[PDB]
Structure 1
């Protein structure tokens, strides 16, 4: 399971093996994290430039 080659979970107390062939998590939400991620850097820069005015 740990290498990931059928990537499922072993249910030990019910002694059954669950198999899920679902690929990695949705692309769309992950791409949002990257966009929001840049924006934090944009704002840090924006405040330093704005320090002169205050």
Structure 2
């Protein structure tokens, strides 16, 4: 059920220690990574227009 991600937790065999944690700011790295991936096409297309007009 942790592999199913229904709640926050992780098991243990050697020590049996239970740890519960969460990561609230999920909407930052998604929007940032999408801006990087979308801007890659912008810079590459710019290099296509300049590479087309120069050579």
TM-score if structure 2 supplies the norm length?
0.67
Contiguous gaps of at least 5 residues in structure 1: none
How far apart in 2 are the matches of 1:10 and 1:25?
24
Deviation at 1:9, TM superposition (A): 0.8
Output the aligned Cα RMSD. 2.0
Q: How many equivalent residue pairs?
A: 53
Deviation at 1:24, TM superposition (A): 5.5
Contiguous gaps of at least 5 residues in structure 2: none
Residue 32, structure 1, aligned to residue 32, structure 2: yes
TM-score if structure 1 supplies the norm length?
0.68
Task: Identify which of structures 1 and 2 has the higher relative contact order when contacts are C-alpha pairs closer than 8 Å and 6+ apart.
Answer: 1
